[PDB]
Amino acid sequence: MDLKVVVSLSSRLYTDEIAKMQQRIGCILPLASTHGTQNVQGLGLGQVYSLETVPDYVSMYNYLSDCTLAVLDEVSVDSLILTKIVPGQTYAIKNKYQPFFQWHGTGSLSVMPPVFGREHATVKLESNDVDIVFPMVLPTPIAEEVLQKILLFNVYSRVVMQAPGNADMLDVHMHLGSVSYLGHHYELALPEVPGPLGLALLDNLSLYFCIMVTLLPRASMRLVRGLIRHEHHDLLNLFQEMVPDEIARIDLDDLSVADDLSRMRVMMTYLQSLASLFNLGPRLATAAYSQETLTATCW
Amino acid sequence: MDLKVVVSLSSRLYTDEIAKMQQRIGCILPLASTHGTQNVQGLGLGQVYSLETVPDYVSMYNYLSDCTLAVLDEVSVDSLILTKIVPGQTYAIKNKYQPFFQWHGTGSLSVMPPVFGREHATVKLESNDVDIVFPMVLPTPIAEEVLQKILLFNVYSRVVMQAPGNADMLDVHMHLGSVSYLGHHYELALPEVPGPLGLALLDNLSLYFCIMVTLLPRASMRLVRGLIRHEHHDLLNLFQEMVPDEIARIDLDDLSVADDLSRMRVMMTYLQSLASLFNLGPRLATAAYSQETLTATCW
Amino acid sequence: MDVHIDNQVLSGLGTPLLVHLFVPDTVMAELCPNRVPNCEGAWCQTLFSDRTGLTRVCRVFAARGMLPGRPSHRGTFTNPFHVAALRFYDEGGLVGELQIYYLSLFEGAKRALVRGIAHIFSPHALYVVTYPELSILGAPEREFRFLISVALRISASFREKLAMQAWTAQQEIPVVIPTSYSRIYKNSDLIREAFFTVQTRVSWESCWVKATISNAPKTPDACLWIDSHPLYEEGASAWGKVIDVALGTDGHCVHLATTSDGQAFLVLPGGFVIKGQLALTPEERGYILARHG
Amino acid sequence: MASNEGVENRPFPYLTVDADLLSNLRQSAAEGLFHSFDLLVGKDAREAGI
Amino acid sequence: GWRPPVFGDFLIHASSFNNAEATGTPLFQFKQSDPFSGVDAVFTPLSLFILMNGLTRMANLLYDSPATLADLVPDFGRLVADRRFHNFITPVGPLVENIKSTYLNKITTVVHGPVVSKAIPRSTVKVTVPQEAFVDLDAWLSGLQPCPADARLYVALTYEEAGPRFTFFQSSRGHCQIMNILRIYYSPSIMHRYAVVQPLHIEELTFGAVACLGTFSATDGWRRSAFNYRGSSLPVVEIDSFYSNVSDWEVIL
């Protein structure tokens, strides 16, 4: 029943840190330990997402899917008092994330790691020399479209770095800068640079999607030719006309025999690891949202 | 709020059987109907998997999904005492299986038919002329790996047919045959003929694959075509300086934001569906584990 | 009819030209004995004589059809002078090779669009559909003469082994003689009939042909491929039986057993066994490797 | 060896012995020094049903 | 015995929601663009049959004129072009309380949990849908199949050549094969849609979307009540012991 647990800090917090936590009381955290009371390094998402080393996105996804989520309730001078989240119980949320994002009644909350700047997302604790990093929560179709636009932007930016002429950056910015949901207009800045080195958050989802999208038609023609029998579902035949012709023209003899097993197997692994990503990790629903009170009754 | 079922045995079983069944205590098995008193035939999985019939795995997944699963609690000479699974309650669990995989903390578990070994998971009751067939519970990544292997085998055993033996010696037995793990390699049982059921699943896969090949974006193919020749990476190690000429024939048109945005949007709408065409098994979230005891706390 | 557009969207975009052919069940009565199974796995291949040799293997699905408005076509639906061959199987023990020829097809494709044509190899009438989107004598003989040359060499090889062994006999299989007749040592009557039938038996699916085509070293070294055709022609001869003996015991069986190494054994009634040797040039290996595998 | 071989978990009225037996008991349990040993975790550390 | 269900409160304008409606019909909510504090614009399935075009006689007797509804969803003809109308129909659950007011109207439903009223110590209720535009997908394809514990009610919304239509499906087997059996069910209506597919571009290809409303107590079945409105004679299936757990719209084709 009583599931509120306290993390105890090593050193006394400064006043700026106190007011910074009082700004962000009712929000979500990753909780590394199922038992609550243990050292401060667990509750931070800084071990996975740090200032020092460039983070790949799937690491944060695999970390968030596993570890539990907790809601801060109280901040005192030597203590942080947290509430664990278990399904089958109702809780409270305030949207103290920074980028204001409108929460409707009966909407679908999704918890996704932040693509924004680090200073926007985290609090540094100079007193205990640690970092606490807050996972972003955003509505489900908006989060879908956020992933869409940042992924397509990574593809266009990497292409224009490959070949400058083919891609116009103004046509990229005018379309991908704007996000419209239900008459609410939010302008989101894209990642600043891809660079020659490994880029900030993306380039891993992009390459996985790219190897997947190139393997998809080559795998699909092989599968459709392999499938044909009596008892196969009839609609397949109706869709045999639906394929574009040049995709249909491919001969199986070119790609070697064991390489069929290689390309198919690699493509299937990428599909299955890739599909559950777009369901967008941890999910919740909210019964009622209060705009003037900024309070969401969630479960 | 009280989960308890007793199964009344028809005739008494011998001491040799009661010894091994008491060894099997604490393991999952599927039951047919939600009643206090059950017949023994619905208790065993062996009704869906007879010895004489051709092995059909995906239909056993179909059978195991419908059949409410129970945990063996007490083995007595006329009685098998089981508690069941409400989706929203927490109960202890034990692992003692012959193809043995050590479980991880906060790694989700899936239930499968016993693909690996016929005698290893099962115990026959010749006193009552049945067989009790224990299913296989695995951590989710290697479970998805075995699922992909069985589906690709149900394809390629159709594909090889007869004429190339050079297909037969490697394709049928290398990727599809062995499941690797850390310091381990375990065999799979391969059906002599690829039988029924899996082919309707391949039909639905082919439907989604044709609809997805209708909507493919070009810029990602540009990223692949640029990176496979101009640079080298570990993800691209499948692709040498050679490109499939397929992507060259699809690669003639220019790039545009407005088309790729919508193409990506529809692919987002369709990759959400593949999680339910992929999953097929019940999920159990592990919250605690005891390596010394082989007794976890699932959820 | 659906098989044509299925091919044109999947295999017709891999192979250039197609001629869509419908086979009556009476024509099917040639290959298959005493069975009417559906013809899905049927593999059509081309084979052209006197220039070069090649086969391309493809399935066109066959289903029985009521769709002809003409009552007569009720039945199954699936450089001229050359061959096409359909290899037909099921899950059971049934394998047949049918030979369709040209100049029934190019003349037949002349305008339910349908026309009747004749078989040359196994003479019956077939029916050709035309969809709205649309040196003679040496040419059949070769598959005959080639194989029959092998038989002559094999038969001559038997004689050489008898020339090894002072021209009598030896028994290699424990079969008790049916009785100790006085009127049995005219068994010269039997061995002559061997050289009667072995030379007058020629088919593509002979036992030694499958012995030539080996998937593995070890398991064919451990396995024997036999065929028994009866004496003097009573009935249907069996080829390609596997041994994963009783044949020597029962009469009416000039048993012939071939190993994958080309070694042969002619077994007579009474368990008399004569060993024979095979000689295959790489041309012959190329031909048998082309068609059989 | 195997966990439960001669281990009978019946609630015998045990004797109290003054001496201490826990000296390196975890490592000796890890290696297998003494056979026929069971580890009972706290939730199953109770008197059994009779 | 479980925790009391999380109620939701809604203020609808009274002209787009009848007072006469039975206690327990499921309701569906529509999202307005600039103002949504005022009018929630919640729909009932009988209203959805009028906004999409003897059920029709009752649906015209209850709801008269439609242009208020056409004002509430102005872009319906643009949404059916793009297959975006299913992205706005959110499921909310069955009806419990209807506090009567002239201009506004106070709807209280059940978002999640076992369906119940709130005044007395939790008198239960039932959830009702009409038997026409309702297809049991357990008697549709019918050793012995096992008897499961729990049954699921799904909802599908399908854009046929005569516009979009919604269906409710009752099965008990599993979520991973109800999709495949629903493709097998909607096979012939799919065969009637690809007449005029080829001029129209990529976005139209989606055939419908599937959500999972909830799990009612199986091994029992349902009953067949009726509507007691003046002219009605309208048969309605009713189910007890309902536990609402509205899901996302999963795409079918």
- Secondary structure (DSSP) of A11-69: SPPPHHHHHHHHHT-S-EEEES-SSS-S-TTTT-STTTS-SSSPPPHHHHHHHHHHSEE
Q: Taking the CB of residue B271, how many other CB atoms lie within 10 A of it?
A: 21
User: Is residue E74 exposed (0-12), middle (13-18) or buried (19+ Cβ within 10 Å)?
Assistant: exposed
How many cross-chain Cβ pairs, A to E, lie less than 8 Å apart? 45
Residue of B nearest to D4 (CA): B23
**B4: its two tokens:** 């308890």
Tell me which amino acid residue C251 is. Answer: G
Rounded (10°) angle between helices B219-230 and A204-227: 100
In this structure, are residues E82 and E76 in contact, taking their beta carbons and an 8 Å threshold? no
Subunit contact E187:A141, Cβ cutoff 8 A: no
Calpha distance E92→E88 (Å, rounded): 12
What dihedral do alpha carbons B261, B262, B268, B274 form, nearest 10°? Answer: -140
For residue B43, what is the DSSP state? H
The strand pair at A68-76 and A28-31 is best described as: antiparallel
Q: Residue C256: which of C189, C222, C209, C204 has the closest Cα?
A: C209
Residues of B in Cβ contact (< 8 Å) with C55: none
> What is the distance between the alpha carbons of residues E241 and E125, in angstroms, rounded to a whole number?
8
Cβ-Cβ contacts under 8 Å, B209 against chain A: 216, 219-220, 223-224
Name the residue with tokens 């037909």: C88
Spatial CA neighbour of A156 closest among B256, B235, B251, B263: B256
Determine whether the interchain pair C10/A228 forms a contact, defined as Cβ–Cβ distance below 8 Å.
Answer: yes
Which one, of B200, B195, B59, lies nearest residue A234 by Cα?
Answer: B200
Q: How far is Cα B144 from Cα B131, in angstroms, rounded to an integer?
A: 27
Burial of residue C256 (number of CB atoms within 10 Å: 0-12, 13-18, 19+): buried
- Any idea what the Cα angle at residue B63 is, between residues B58 and B68, rounded to 5°? 140
Cβ separation of C215 and B165 shorter than 8 Å? yes
| Encoded tokens for A102 | 């409108």
Query: For strand C95-101 and strand C114-118, is the pairing parallel, antiparallel, or unpaired?
Result: unpaired
CB-based contacts of B169: which residues, under 8 Å, 6+ apart?
Answer: none
Residue D33, Cβ density class (10 Å: 0-12 exposed, 13-18 middle, ≥19 buried): exposed
What's the rounded Cα separation, in Å, for the pair B290 and B105? 9
- Work out whether the CA dihedral E43, E46, E47, E51 comes out positive or negative: positive
Give chain A positions within 8 Å (CB) of E3.
88-89
Picking from B206, B261, B275, the nearest residue to A227 by CB comes out as B206
> Secondary structure of chain D: what % helix, strand, coil (to 5)?
20, 0, 80
CA separation for the pair A160, A207 (Å, rounded): 16
CA distance, residue B181 to nearest chain D CA (Å): 24
CA distance A96 to A82: 16
Q: Which technique? A: cryo-EM
Place of tokens 């956020």: A146
Burial C8-23 (b: 16+ CB within 10 A, else e): bbbbebbeeebbbbbb
Q: How far is CA E126 from CA E21, E113, E149, E237, in A?
A: 14, 13, 19, 10
Q: How far apart are CA D17 and CA D30, in angstroms?
A: 24
DSSP E102: S
List of chain D residues whose C-beta atoms are within 8 Å of the C-beta of residue B95 = none
Closest CA to A213 of E145, B152, B216: B216
Residues from chain C that touch B163, judged by Cβ atoms under 8 A, are 57, 293
Amino acid identity, position C182: S
Rounded Cα–Cα distance for residues C39 and C30 (Å): 14
Measured between CB atoms, does E175 come within 8 Å of chain B? yes
Q: Are C293 and B165 a contacting pair at CB < 8 A?
A: yes
Instruction: Identify which of A52, A62, A223, A49 has the alpha carbon closest to the alpha carbon of residue A132.
Output: A49
Taking the alpha carbons of E174, E180, E182, E185 in that order, is the dihedral positive or negative? Answer: negative
The amino acid present at B175, given as its one-letter code, is H
What distances in angstroms separate CA B271 from CA B118, B213, B277, one per listed residue?
A: 36, 12, 10
Cβ count within 10 A of residue E245: 15
CB contact under 8 A, A287 and E33: no
List residues in chain D touching B: CB distance below 8 A. Answer: 39, 41, 43
- Contacts of residue A155, Cβ cutoff 8 Å, sequence gap at least 6: A206, A210, B217, B219, B220, B223, B260
Would the CB atoms of B92 and D43 count as touching at under 8 Å? yes
Contact between B70 and B5 (Cβ < 8 Å): yes
What is residue E2's DSSP assignment?
A: P
Cβ-Cβ contacts under 8 Å, D5 against chain B: none
CA dist., res. C3 & res. C11, Å (int) = 10
> What stretches of chain B show up as alpha helix (H) in DSSP?
15-23, 40-43, 57-66, 118-121, 140-160, 165-171, 198-214, 219-230, 245-250, 257-271, 274-278
Q: Which residues contact E64 (CB under 8 A, 6 or more apart)?
A: none
Instruction: Give the DSSP H or E segment for C229.
Output: strand C224-229
Pair of tokens at residue C94:
């049934």
> Which one of B266, B271, B274, B280 makes the best mutation probe of the E interface by having the most chain E beta carbons within 10 Å?
B266
Q: How far apart are CA B171 and CA B163, in angstroms?
A: 13
Q: How far apart are the C-alpha atoms of C143 and C148, rounded to whole Å?
A: 9
Distance CA B215, CA C196 (A): 69
C95-to-C206, C238, C292 alpha-carbon distances in Å: 13, 12, 12
Measured in degrees and rounded to the nearest 5, phi and psi for residue B103 equal: -85, 160
What residue of A is the nearest CA neighbor of E35? A183
Helix axes A257-275, A204-227, angle to 10 degrees: 120
If you count them, how many residues does chain C have?
293
HSE toward the beta carbon, residue A287, CA cutoff 13 A: 20
Structural contact between residues C69 and C128, judged by C-beta atoms closer than 8 angstroms: no
Q: Report the b/e string of C269-280 with b at 16+ CB within 10 A.
A: bbbbbbbbebee
Comparing CA positions, the residue from E69, E47, E67 lying closest to residue E59 is: E47
Measured distance CA(A129)–CA(A135) in Å, rounded? 20
Q: What is the largest CA-CA distance in chain A?
A: 75
User: Chain-centre distance of CA B79, in angstroms?
Assistant: 31
Rounded distance between C-alpha atoms, residue B180 and residue B122, angstroms: 23
Contact present, A268 and A215 (Cβ < 8 Å): no
3-state SS class at B204: helix
Sequence-ordered list of residues with C-beta below 8 angstroms from that of E38, at least 6 positions apart, any chain? E11, E13
Edge-to-edge strand list for the sheet holding C83-89: C58-59, C43-47, C83-89, C95-101
Q: How far is CA E197 from CA A1, A200, A220, B216, in A?
A: 57, 42, 22, 18
Select from E52, A34, D6, C213 the least CA-distant residue to B106: A34
Q: How far apart, in whole angstroms, are the C-alpha atoms of residue C196 and residue C188?
A: 12
Residue type, A271: L
A248: Cα within 13 Å, side-chain hemisphere: 18
Q: Which residues of A touch C2 (CB under 8 A)?
A: 237
Distance, in Å, from the CA atom of B291 to the CA atom of D30, rounded to the nearest integer, reads 12
CA atoms of C139 and C25, how far apart (whole Å): 27
Q: How far is residue E52's CA from residue E73's CA, in Å, rounded to a whole number?
A: 11
Closest C-alpha to B58, from B3, B113, B7: B113
- A221, A224, A227, A228: best to mutate for the C interface, most C CBs within 10 A: A228
Structure tokens at E155: 């909802």
Contact (Cβ atoms closer than 8 angstroms) between residue E24 and residue E115 = yes
- Helix then strand then coil, % of chain A, to nearest 5: 35, 20, 45
For every residue of B244-282, DSSP letters joined together read -HHHHHHTTS---HHHHHHHHHHHHHHHTTHHHHH--S-
Contacts of E143 in chain B (CB under 8 A): 47
Residue C119 identity: H
- Distance separating the N- and C-terminal Cα atoms of chain E: 40
* Nearest C-alpha in B relative to C213: B165
